[PDB]
Amino acid sequence: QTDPTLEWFLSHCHIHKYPSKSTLIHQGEKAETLYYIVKGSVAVLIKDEEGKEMILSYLNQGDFIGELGLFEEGQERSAWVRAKTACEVAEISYKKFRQLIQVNPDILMRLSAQMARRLQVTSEKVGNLAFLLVTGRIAQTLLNLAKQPDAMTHPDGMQIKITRQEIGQIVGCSRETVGRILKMLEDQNLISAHGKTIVVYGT
Amino acid sequence: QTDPTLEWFLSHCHIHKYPSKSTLIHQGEKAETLYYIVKGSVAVLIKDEEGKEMILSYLNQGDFIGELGLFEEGQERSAWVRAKTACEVAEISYKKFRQLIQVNPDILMRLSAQMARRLQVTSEKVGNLAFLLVTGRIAQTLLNLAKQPDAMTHPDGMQIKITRQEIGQIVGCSRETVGRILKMLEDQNLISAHGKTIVVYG
Ligand code: PRO
Ligand code: PRO
């Protein structure tokens, strides 16, 4: 079971290998290139006002990078992209990709499908104004605990001792809701959680 | 002022009119369509825990519905779609649309642009801890104002009066951070903003 459409597309791309931690795309770069991840994983990241790194999302094999620029012709990169693992990345100009689409739209279907599957996950994960309020209070709770005397110093920030159940009691939501928000914050490079302890970054 | 490709796409569609509040796509519908709003607006809804109505998207003229199922045909989700206003919606089978894509990929491009903009909106929610707290305090401030006696009844919820500087001064953040948060809240379909006037939904 070969993939004729993919290898056709790939022959039109410049394929380069990036060691882990190397930067593929810099913030502010003119967006004129579409990327396809042949192998490996990347992190899409932005910075704080104090220059601390936050992860918008991870992109894996089969994902494209820079799809928005293909349609919106502004256009400067909003995010750095850095190799999470050693990766192989295919590169094509927007101009070349637009002519290929005309000839074989299956490759547009490929690009569209992987966006759609990424949209699906959050089709679920929603939350209203209340959930956003709860999120604020959880952050408040974590920030305040990291400031208190009984917080332990950690290479990545300040370590605090609190369960998800206790956060939920304070903030007025279920421990399941806390789990989801904590997992989100950990995915985003804002905290780490292990056992009953949480490391709040930057503090 | 002519869009021949759209006319071509629409000639392959069945166009239906829906009065406001009427359902377009029911819960658990096996996904095989592909909708295009010709006129008006719709709401995408889900029930939360216990069973209260919640908005996933407000979609307007030129927007697609059912575009995620195009790449996952047969999909059943718990969401449903309702007419916000009187609307006119073109529908087409995924099967037929796939035949059209080979001829002219332009409609798939418009659909994909919508999906790409949505991924970008989702990215703008991130999100440091201080930021998330400020966001919650801003939401809190708007929500409490909508509960006050001097709030006005609006079809979409409660209409309140407050400036961006007033919000910033109260909460303790820059005017730039207030703009960023209100925009985020509007993109999340939680409020609408028009000058001093803010409508808090629900
Ligand atoms: O379940 C509901 O609430 C909506 C009402 C119309 C059809 N589905
Ligand atoms: O160019 C195309 O592919 C179709 C033909 C008629 C309208 N647009």
- CA B7 from chain centre, in angstroms, equals 25
Q: Are strands B197-201 and B191-194 parallel, antiparallel or unpaired?
A: antiparallel
Strands (E), chain B: 14-18, 23-25, 33-39, 41-47, 53-60, 64-65, 80-83, 87-93, 152-154, 157-161, 191-194, 197-201
Instruction: State the count of interchain CB pairs (< 8 A) between A and B.
Output: 132
Cα A84 to Cα A60: distance, rounded to the nearest angstrom: 10
Task: State the Cα–Cα distance between residues B131 and A139, nearest whole angstrom.
Answer: 9
Resolution (A): 2.3
Residue B8 Cα to ligand 2 midpoint, Å, equals 7
Compute φ and ψ for B2, nearest 5 degrees.
-105, 145
Which residues does chain B have within 8 Å of residue A188's beta carbon, measured at their own beta carbons? Answer: 126-127
- Spell out a b/e string for A116-129, using b for 16 or more CB atoms within 10 Å of the CB, else e: bebbeeeeeeebbb
Do the beta carbons of residue B64 and residue B34 sit within 8 Å? Answer: yes
State how far the Cα of B60 lies from the Cα of B36, in Å rounded to an integer: 9
The residue type at B106: D
**Contact of B88 with B38, CB cutoff 8 Å:** yes
Please list, residue by residue across A6-36, b when 16 or more beta carbons sit within 10 angstroms of its beta carbon and e when fewer do: beebeeebeeeebeeeeebbeeeeebebbbb
C-beta atoms surrounding A49 within 10 Å = 10
The enclosing H or E element of A145 equals: helix A129-147
d(CA A122, CA A114): 14
Question: Minimal Cα–Cα distance from A30 to chain B, Å?
Answer: 17
Distance from CA of B66 to the nearest CA of A (A): 11
- Chain centroid to Cα A139, Å, comes to 19
Start-to-end CA distance of chain A, whole Å, equals: 51
CB neighbourhood size of A38 (10 A):
17
- Distance, in Å, from the CA atom of B16 to the CA atom of A77, rounded to the nearest integer, reads 40
CB B128 within 8 A of CB A190: yes
Mutate to test the interface with B, among A44, A46, A71, A101 (most CBs of B within 10 A): A71
Distance CA B66, CA B74 (A): 11
For the record, the structure tokens of A172 come out as: 């007025």
Closest CA to B134 of B159, B167, B104: B167
**Subunit contact B128:A44, Cβ cutoff 8 A:** no
Is the separation of the CB atoms in B121 and B185 below 8 Å? no
Domains of chain B: 1-126 (2.60.120.10), 127-202 (1.10.10.10)
Query: B70 contacts in A (CB within 8 Å)?
Result: 112, 116
Within 8 A by CB and 6+ apart from A194, the residues are none
Please, are residues B154 and B194 in contact by the beta-carbon 8 Å criterion? no
| HSE-CB of A108 using CA atoms within 13 angstroms | 28
CB A89 within 8 A of CB A18: yes
- The residue whose C-alpha atom lies closest to atom 1 belonging to ligand 2 is B104
Measured by CA distance, the residue closest to atom 6 of ligand 1 is: B23
A67 contacts B123? CB cut-off 8 A? no
B97: nearest Cα among B123, B122, B124, B64: B64
Of B115, B137, B185, the CB nearest to A136: B137
β-pair type (A64-65, A33-39): antiparallel
- Does B105 sit in the ligand 2 pocket, CB within 6 Å? no
